[PDB]
Design an enzyme around this catalytic site. Structure first.
Site, PDB file in Angstrom:
ATOM      1  N   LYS A 177      -4.014 -10.064  -7.913  1.00 15.50           N
ATOM      2  CA  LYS A 177      -4.779  -9.479  -6.816  1.00 15.50           C
ATOM      3  C   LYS A 177      -5.832  -8.568  -7.445  1.00 15.50           C
ATOM      4  O   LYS A 177      -5.495  -7.718  -8.257  1.00 15.50           O
ATOM      5  CB  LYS A 177      -3.868  -8.691  -5.870  1.00 15.50           C
ATOM      6  CG  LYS A 177      -4.563  -8.186  -4.610  1.00 15.50           C
ATOM      7  CD  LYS A 177      -3.576  -7.464  -3.694  1.00 15.50           C
ATOM      8  CE  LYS A 177      -4.190  -7.141  -2.333  1.00 15.50           C
ATOM      9  NZ  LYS A 177      -4.793  -5.780  -2.236  1.00 15.50           N
ATOM     10  N   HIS A 223      -3.756  -3.063   7.755  1.00  9.57           N
ATOM     11  CA  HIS A 223      -4.694  -3.295   6.656  1.00  9.57           C
ATOM     12  C   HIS A 223      -5.166  -1.979   6.098  1.00  9.57           C
ATOM     13  O   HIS A 223      -5.286  -1.011   6.840  1.00  9.57           O
ATOM     14  CB  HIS A 223      -5.933  -4.052   7.128  1.00  9.57           C
ATOM     15  CG  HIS A 223      -5.655  -5.427   7.634  1.00  9.57           C
ATOM     16  ND1 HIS A 223      -5.967  -5.819   8.918  1.00  9.57           N
ATOM     17  CD2 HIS A 223      -5.097  -6.506   7.033  1.00  9.57           C
ATOM     18  CE1 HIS A 223      -5.617  -7.082   9.088  1.00  9.57           C
ATOM     19  NE2 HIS A 223      -5.084  -7.523   7.960  1.00  9.57           N
ATOM     20  N   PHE A 224      -5.442  -1.948   4.797  1.00 12.60           N
ATOM     21  CA  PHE A 224      -6.078  -0.801   4.174  1.00 12.60           C
ATOM     22  C   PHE A 224      -7.557  -1.121   4.062  1.00 12.60           C
ATOM     23  O   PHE A 224      -7.942  -2.044   3.336  1.00 12.60           O
ATOM     24  CB  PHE A 224      -5.492  -0.554   2.780  1.00 12.60           C
ATOM     25  CG  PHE A 224      -5.900   0.763   2.189  1.00 12.60           C
ATOM     26  CD1 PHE A 224      -7.040   0.868   1.401  1.00 12.60           C
ATOM     27  CD2 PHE A 224      -5.158   1.907   2.445  1.00 12.60           C
ATOM     28  CE1 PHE A 224      -7.426   2.090   0.881  1.00 12.60           C
ATOM     29  CE2 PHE A 224      -5.536   3.122   1.920  1.00 12.60           C
ATOM     30  CZ  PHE A 224      -6.669   3.214   1.134  1.00 12.60           C
ATOM     31  N   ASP A 225      -8.394  -0.380   4.781  1.00 11.70           N
ATOM     32  CA  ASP A 225      -9.820  -0.708   4.818  1.00 11.70           C
ATOM     33  C   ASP A 225     -10.617  -0.078   3.671  1.00 11.70           C
ATOM     34  O   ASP A 225     -11.445  -0.741   3.037  1.00 11.70           O
ATOM     35  CB  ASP A 225     -10.430  -0.294   6.163  1.00 11.70           C
ATOM     36  CG  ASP A 225     -11.722  -1.032   6.462  1.00 11.70           C
ATOM     37  OD1 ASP A 225     -11.722  -2.274   6.331  1.00 11.70           O
ATOM     38  OD2 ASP A 225     -12.731  -0.381   6.816  1.00 11.70           O
ATOM     39  N   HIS A 255       0.750  -1.256   0.000  1.00 11.22           N
ATOM     40  CA  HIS A 255       0.000   0.000   0.000  1.00 11.22           C
ATOM     41  C   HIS A 255       0.777   1.302   0.000  1.00 11.22           C
ATOM     42  O   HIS A 255       0.172   2.354  -0.099  1.00 11.22           O
ATOM     43  CB  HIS A 255      -0.999   0.012   1.159  1.00 11.22           C
ATOM     44  CG  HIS A 255      -1.981  -1.109   1.088  1.00 11.22           C
ATOM     45  ND1 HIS A 255      -2.881  -1.239   0.049  1.00 11.22           N
ATOM     46  CD2 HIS A 255      -2.170  -2.186   1.890  1.00 11.22           C
ATOM     47  CE1 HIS A 255      -3.602  -2.332   0.235  1.00 11.22           C
ATOM     48  NE2 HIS A 255      -3.190  -2.927   1.343  1.00 11.22           N
TER      49      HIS A 255
HETATM   50 CL   LIG Z   1      -6.811  -2.097  -1.113  1.00  8.13          CL
END
Ligand SMILES: [Cl-]
Ligand SMILES: [Cl-]
Lengths: 124, 124
Positions: free
Chosen positions: A41, A119-121, A12
């Site tokens: 992905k 995490h990227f929410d 990210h």
């Molecule tokens: Cl993402």
């Protein structure tokens, strides 16, 4: 095994550009960050700010995560981001992505000591 | 049982305002759309465009969904949206939400005949 913090960085963070400069940004970045190794992905967001600025979000606005957990934080300011999403023409091992640049608040889940993004929410 | 299309309308459409006009928008809308009945829905986005404009997204840009399905579509244009997310002070039955207004592309999953939105995947 990759740590959760390190995986977040790899997936990210892109601090070396102010913004996506072309439609091919995602194809290039998804490959180089090893996100197309065995399968494509489907969706992935890169943040164009310093690592320190993104880590700082973990002490900004506490908000619910989409999954109901309470360890998410929303950036007070908007940040330059690029969303990468597979297109219809995408088929492993020939992954293909649409690049969408935006300036939005980010929401990350944070964990650990130090308390850092894992995490990227979402973006808003 | 509510149909998937009808649930999407109830959870995600608010065509009667051009934008969130105050910080209390989410508290009010989450309650009235029955999203705080037995528990507080943690995260929910409302779209401030006509139902027709949102339905039209199902024939716009085909993109991957976050979950890897191929029935997602990204709006060609940005739309006025409000993200509602529970705050730290939120505790059922006293739900509390942060209201964040933005103008962003939306991504929805579409299904059925007619082929209409059934999930809100993300905004960009
Ligand atoms: Cl993402
Ligand atoms: Cl939502």
């Amino acid at each position: 095994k990759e740590t959760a913090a390190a995986k977040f960085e790899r997936q990210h963070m892109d601090s070396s550009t102010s913004a996506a400069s072309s439609s091919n940004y995602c194809n290039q970045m998804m490959k180089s960050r090893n996100l197309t190794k065995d399968r494509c992905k489907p969706v992935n967001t890169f943040v164009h700010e310093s690592l320190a600025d993104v880590q700082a979000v973990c002490s900004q606005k506490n908000v619910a995560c989409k999954n109901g957990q309470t360890n998410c934080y929303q950036s007070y300011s908007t940040m330059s981001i690029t969303d990468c999403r597979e297109t219809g023409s995408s088929k492993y091992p020939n992954c293909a992505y649409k690049t969408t640049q935006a300036n939005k608040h980010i929401i990350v889940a944070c964990e650990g000591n130090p308390y850092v993004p894992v995490h990227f929410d979402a973006s808003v």
